[PDB]
Amino acid sequence: VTLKSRPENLSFARCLNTTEAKFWQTDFLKRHTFKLPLLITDKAVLASKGHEMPPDKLEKEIMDPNPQKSQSCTLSTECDTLRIDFGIKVLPVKESMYSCSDYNYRTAIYQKIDEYIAEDGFLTLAKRYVNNIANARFLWRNRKGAEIIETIVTIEDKEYPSFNSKSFNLDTFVEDNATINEIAQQIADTFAGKREYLNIYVTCFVKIGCAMEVYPSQEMTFDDDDKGKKLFKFEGSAGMHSQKINNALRTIDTWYPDYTTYEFPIPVENYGAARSIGIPFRPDTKSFYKLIDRMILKNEDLPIEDKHYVMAILIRGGMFS
């Protein structure tokens, strides 16, 4: 019954499956009675070369500015508030292992998930996920200027008490409010297998102003030149990628080694990598690729912070041997 290695095919599925985040434009005094479409507009930009260059060909850079047809979005000279609608389906973690070659590791992972299910049943992580819902980080750069950010979180035809998103800071997580705890309790239940699915529809109103600029999710252009800001279009309207929304709702890792010195949550990844900051925050030790080999292959009791991490990457998936 001893465990030697990790399976050749060890693949978890997403237990937090988000839809795309479809954009709409509305007025804030009549948000509940308004829903105008937000369309991607097309604009010509002229190449302002701001990259570094020695004083050899800067005159050639200023001589021939090649224009680029960039897709950018302005709302309307009438609307005043972004309406994001996006859905999330939370599925039980146990019924998400997409492949496990060995069966002994499978029953070891099922016993280990149940061990966590007994002590803190996915309530800490759920509260943190719904705290990531609450502060409205869905808006990555759209959040940068607003007066009221209001997120309504509908759970199965039950419109919950609406959230103020600027009162909740980006760097601290709240365990007190009643709505966040009961929504997190439903998500904790869904994680269990006590409930087999939960559809959560979240609508965010951000009042950036009148005729201001939105910032949708960019898309990779075709490789045969045509370099320009091609934004995402979902149903003849702007939208954000479910990968951005999941990375927004995956920034729950405060239990990283260099915390007391950086004091900023990073998004959950296999070696603790933040692409905008650099210097991977969880290298060597505190890395699933050693922690679950210390938890399943060997058999000690990790502390609850590393236990919080090591089963928080299990909503994400993608491993191997």
Site for a copy of itself in 192-211 (CB under 8 A): 196-197, 199, 201, 208-211
Alpha helices in 36-138 (DSSP H): 58-63, 104-118, 124-134
Q: Which of residues 105-134 bind a copy of itself (CB under 8 A)?
A: none
Q: From the CB of residue 234, how many other CB atoms can be counted at a distance below 10 Å?
A: 16
Is residue 169 close enough to count as binding a copy of itself by CB under 8 A? no
Q: Are 75 and 211 in contact (CB under 8 A)?
A: yes
Select from 148, 243, 263, 304 the one that contacts a copy of itself (CB under 8 A).
243
Is residue 181 close enough to count as binding a copy of itself by CB under 8 A? no
CB of 81 to a copy of itself, least distance (A): 13
Is residue 51 close enough to count as binding a copy of itself by CB under 8 A? yes
Q: Are 73 and 193 in contact (CB under 8 A)?
A: no
C-alpha 74/C-alpha 288 separation (Å) is 43
Select from 5, 29, 62, 175 the one that contacts a copy of itself (CB under 8 A).
62
Select from 116, 265, 269, 307 the one that contacts a copy of itself (CB under 8 A).
269
Q: Which stretch binds a copy of itself (CB under 8 A): 16-24, 117-125, 181-189, 296-304?
A: 16-24
DSSP 313: G
CB of 255 to a copy of itself, least distance (A): 19
Is residue 158 close enough to count as binding a copy of itself by CB under 8 A? no
Select from 79, 82, 93, 100 the one that contacts a copy of itself (CB under 8 A).
100
DSSP 294: I
Is residue 164 close enough to count as binding a copy of itself by CB under 8 A? no
CA 258 to the chain's CA centroid: 22
Question: With the CA atoms of 281, 284, 286 and 290 taken in that order, what torsion angle do they form, in degrees rounded to the nearest 10?
Answer: 140
C-alpha 185/C-alpha 134 separation (Å) is 15
C-alpha 280/C-alpha 258 separation (Å) is 10
Is residue 19 close enough to count as binding a copy of itself by CB under 8 A? yes
Q: Which stretch binds a copy of itself (CB under 8 A): 3-11, 127-135, 172-180, 297-305?
A: 3-11
Say how many Å lie between the first and final Cα of the chain, rounded: 20
Q: Are 21 and 85 in contact (CB under 8 A)?
A: yes
Q: Which is nearer to a copy of itself, 12 or 255 (CB)?
A: 12
Is residue 189 close enough to count as binding a copy of itself by CB under 8 A? no
Is residue 236 close enough to count as binding a copy of itself by CB under 8 A? no
Beta strands 198-206; 149-155: pairing state:
antiparallel
Instruction: Using CB atoms within 10 Å of the CB of residue 252, give its burial: 0 to 12 exposed, 13 to 18 middle, 19+ buried.
Output: buried
C-alpha 235/C-alpha 281 separation (Å) is 38
Q: Which is nearer to a copy of itself, 275 or 298 (CB)?
A: 275
CB of 184 to a copy of itself, least distance (A): 19
Select from 13, 123, 152, 192 the one that contacts a copy of itself (CB under 8 A).
13
Is residue 150 close enough to count as binding a copy of itself by CB under 8 A? no
Place of tokens 């030790």: 285
Is residue 214 close enough to count as binding a copy of itself by CB under 8 A? no
Q: Which is nearer to a copy of itself, 121 or 209 (CB)?
A: 209
- Is the C-alpha dihedral spanning 203, 15, 317, 267 positive or negative? positive
Is residue 235 close enough to count as binding a copy of itself by CB under 8 A? yes
Q: Which of residues 248-267 bind a copy of itself (CB under 8 A)?
A: 262
